């Protein structure tokens, strides 16, 4: 029934899983990254972002991006996806003959190297989709250790300045091939002597011992190499002699010459080396070496260190001593802790300068994906770390940190866009992209979506897709305010639109007083200070913002945890807290008008006030309408109060009554509305002002239980009820207008219930007779079933995975344009010339090769023409 209803779902917010990869172009300045269903997203400038759904929902291992029109996408199953920047679907799906080990890929050049479990290098053309007739064998098994077990392919890696030279490493060799002259260059074997210490982890150290090699690099002037070893040994060696100028240790040097009364000296357990980036600055000639340590326990044992090797020097005229001295004594070394225990699973560098040196060119950032999903940003070299929200686009921010917790708020658009109008995003990072302008019809009310991290920030924006709403949002730090740096997890936060005003509630019980104002333009702070409740942090506030939300007061109760926060929109704000307390603040002032238990005062065992509720009504049978509090048990009662204006503007509080309105507790939704007009009874300033009227509004107040909900009347022994189920976790009133006659404006108000099990319906009131009975369409966690708010207009925002939120709109009849994708490539963007080998540093000793020799060689001279419009573009 009621055609004028149909689910119907709006927006999207985060990623619908967790990232497992990350890769980033330069040329074009997006950045991709990978779920573990096989989605990528690529987002770019203000709010720029585009979803591509692989066809298979396995994970992926890595991307690239080639040509800056190229995205290549691995999965587990060693299957390789090619897509595109300018037609955005997925271009090639390519079966590879065996098990992925190490890919490189170039930003000039076509072609992907691969090797393989089995120890065979391929080559795939990627602007072709063909697989190239250059195969190489197992060199180690073929040329140096017969007997040995078939080793797979450690590590490829392009030369970073010819890309003729291809550094190959195995299990216990590495070499250099060549593919202009088909052999092979120069072959490194890392042998210990007996009773060497070799690495930290080196195991039997009486025998001589051949470590497993794990990865190897070049250099940026590419005549260095690194070989990191099983036992955690770090061997520089030159490329073309084939000479090692030295084994060291991220601590101690020398190694590879027995010591025979050698004594582990280290007071930090030792960590596996998990990874290990060589990235350049702005000069390539000044470099640094970041390494990620593989944690043992469970402890905090996932740390990076930097070693800044500063001027390298040069290479014609200094000896391999001089090579030994500039690698073990480095010109700075530092370890940066990572905050949380978490694993590390990605390390993604974010170019600045260039895409080439692996993508380690001059990195302002570093982006870590960690195991449960999050995502992290390295300031380098600097080491600080960074969560705030203007770097990302806004989808980004709901992984950095985890949102502990979600609200959506139905704001008035008067002063909510002049709000937005100066609150717009000037520092994002990523500056590809061109944003296709989706114009939204204006409207007296919008909606805004408010998150709470883990980090102890609040961030804030407008759901839409407008003109301004779409690059505006607000950040808010609970750690300046408190001058606190641990415990800082937000449990429960209240939005009052009406005159923007927020409250903040932590895992401690702190509670924390936000207001819309403009801007008054110690080290000591802390909240043990002063023995008030209420602690003033007005002068507490960011610096460089003119204008926005700023803190006010700071509640230290020492009472516990939070039940139950509301900040009203007359200025009043509601504090329960698990131990009994019930507290109202006067925002005039600051001041506290009611500060007691509520355990002393039930007729019941509750124990706590678990939803606060402002409305201005007839209590009972006053004749008159005044300023009441509802409040909510969690043993299903109900205390009614009222708030008398009292002498000097001060207010007072009396309390009425408490009735145990159901069994079925707890109390988490309560709102109301008016018996004739059957408007909204909550609480306003004009609301407020008209109290002098002698105005009396009989209304009925929504109470929810656990799966029930009452309507009730204040004063009054009648209620009815209505019963579901499964229990409810989020509802709300909503108004919409229905037009039917001729141009009649039918105002109807209806109920949205949602079920924790995802089922939606929509009621009529009083009645509560059914108008729609359907489901979402997704399943949703029933941890962030919970966290859904219901807005004015018949919308709905459920949190349906850890990183995900979805606003539905329940009006069948919404004036929504056909989608519009947006533009990743634009054309006439330049890749700058990739480094070729400095003559003035190794001069001879190489055959300058052009891509296109290359292509000769690797395709053959009849290579075929693409069947790509993108490989003509991308030139
Ligand atoms: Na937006």
Not at 594 to 612: D, F, H, K, L, P
Not at 730 to 753: P, Q
């Amino acid at each position: 029934k009621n055609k004028i209803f149909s689910l119907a779902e709006t927006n999207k917010y985060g990623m619908s899983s967790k990232p497992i990869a990350a890769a980033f172009d330069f040329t074009q300045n997006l950045l991709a990254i990978a779920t573990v269903t096989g989605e990528v997203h690529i987002y770019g400038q203000q709010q720029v972002e585009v979803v591509i759904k692989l066809e298979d929902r396995s994970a992926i291992k890595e991307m690239r991006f080639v040509k800056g029109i190229y995205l290549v996408v691995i999965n587990a199953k060693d299957t390789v996806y090619v897509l595109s920047l300018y037609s955005q679907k997925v271009l090639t799906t390519v079966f590879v003959p065996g098990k992925i080990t190490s890919i490189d890929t170039d930003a000039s050049l076509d072609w992907m190297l691969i090797g393989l479990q089995n120890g065979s290098m391929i080559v795939y053309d990627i602007d072709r989709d063909q697989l190239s007739s250059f195969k190489l064998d197992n060199l180690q098994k073929s040329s140096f250790f017969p007997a040995a077990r078939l080793s797979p392919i450690v590590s490829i890696q392009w030369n970073p300045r010819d890309i003729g030279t291809v550094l190959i490493s195995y299990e216990y060799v590495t070499l250099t091939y060549s593919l202009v002259e088909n052999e092979i260059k120069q072959s490194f074997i890392y042998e210990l002597p007996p009773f060497a210490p070799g690495g930290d982890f080196s195991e039997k150290t009486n025998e001589k011992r051949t470590p497993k090699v794990i990865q190897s690099l070049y250099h940026p002037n590419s005549l260095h190499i690194i070989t990191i070893h099983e036992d955690n040994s770090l061997v520089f060696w030159d490329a073309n002699s084939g000479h090692m100028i030295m084994a060291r240790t991220v601590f101690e040097t020398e190694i590879n010459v027995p010591q025979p009364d050698y004594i582990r000296d280290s007071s930090t357990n030792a960590a596996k080396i998990s990874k290990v980036y060589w990235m350049c600055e702005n000069n390539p000639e000044y470099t640094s070496l970041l390494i990620s340590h593989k944690s043992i326990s469970r402890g905090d044992n996932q740390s990076l260190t930097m070693i800044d090797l500063g001027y390298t020097p040069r290479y014609s005229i200094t000896s391999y001593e001089g090579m030994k001295n500039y690698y073990a004594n480095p010109k700075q070394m530092k370890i940066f802790p990572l905050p949380t225990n978490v694993p590390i699973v990605n390390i993604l560098p974010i170019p600045r300068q260039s895409p080439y040196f692996a993508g380690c060119h001059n990195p302002g950032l570093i982006l870590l994906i960690l195991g449960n999903g999050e995502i992290e940003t390295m300031l380098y070299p600097s080491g600080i770390f960074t969560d705030k929200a203007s770097l990302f686009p806004q989808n980004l921010s709901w992984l950095r940190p985890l949102a502990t917790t979600s609200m959506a708020a139905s704001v008035p658009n008067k002063l909510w866009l002049g709000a937005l109008s100066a609150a717009q995003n000037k520092d994002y990072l990523l500056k590809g992209g061109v944003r296709t302008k989706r114009q939204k019809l204006p409207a007296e009310y919008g909606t805004a979506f408010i998150t709470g991290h883990s980090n102890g920030s609040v961030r804030i924006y407008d759901a839409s897709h407008g003109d301004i709403q779409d690059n505006a949002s607000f950040e808010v730090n609970l750690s300046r305010t408190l001058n606190k740096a641990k415990e800082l997890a937000v449990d429960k936060i209240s939005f009052a639109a009406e005159t923007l005003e927020l409250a903040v509630s932590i895992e401690t019980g702190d509670v924390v007083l936000f207001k819309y104002e403009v801007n008054q333009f110690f080290r000591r702070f802390s909240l043990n200070n002063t023995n008030g409740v209420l602690v003033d942090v007005r002068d507490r506030a960011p610096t460089g913002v003119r204008q926005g939300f700023m803190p006010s007061t700071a509640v230290h109760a020492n009472k516990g945890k939070t039940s139950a926060i509301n900040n009203s929109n007359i200025g009043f704000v509601g504090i329960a807290y698990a131990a009994g307390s019930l507290m109202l603040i006067d925002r005039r002032g600051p001041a506290i008008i009611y500060m007691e238990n509520i355990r002393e005062i039930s007729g019941a065992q509750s124990a706590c006030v678990t939803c606060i509720e402002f409305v201005i009504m007839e209590y009972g049978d006053d004749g008159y309408s005044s300023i009441l509090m509802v409040c909510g048990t969690d043993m299903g009662e109900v205390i009614t109060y009222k708030i008398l204006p009292a002498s000097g503007g001060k207010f007072d509080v009396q309390l009425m009554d408490i009735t145990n309105v159901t069994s079925k507790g707890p109390i988490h939704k309560i709102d109301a509305f008016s018996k004739e007009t059957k408007s909204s009874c909550l609480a306003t300033i004009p609301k407020m002002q008209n109290l002098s009227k002698g105005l009396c509004i009989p209304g009925i107040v929504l109470i929810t239980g656990f799966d029930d909900i009452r309507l009730i009347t204040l004063g009054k022994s009648k209620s009815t009820h209505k019963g579901f189920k499964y229990p409810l976790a989020a509802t709300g009133l909503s108004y919409i207008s229905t037009v039917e006659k001729n141009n009649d404006r039918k105002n109807l108000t209806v109920i949205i219930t949602l079920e924790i099990n995802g089922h939606l319906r929509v009621f009529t009131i009083p009645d509560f007779k059914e108008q729609m009975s359907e489901h979402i369409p997704f399943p949703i966690a029933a941890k962030y079933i919970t966290e859904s708010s219901v807005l004015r207009n018949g919308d709905i925002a459920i949190r349906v995975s850890e990183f995900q939120a979805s606003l539905f709109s329940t009006v069948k009849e919404q004036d929504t344009l056909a989608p519009v994708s947006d533009t990743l490539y634009i054309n006439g963007i330049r890749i700058p010339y990739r480094p070729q080998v400095n003559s003035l540093q190794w001069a001879r000793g190489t055959v300058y090769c052009t891509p296109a020799q290359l292509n000769e060689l690797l395709g053959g001279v009849n290579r075929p023409a693409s069947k790509y419009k993108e490989s003509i573009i991308a030139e």
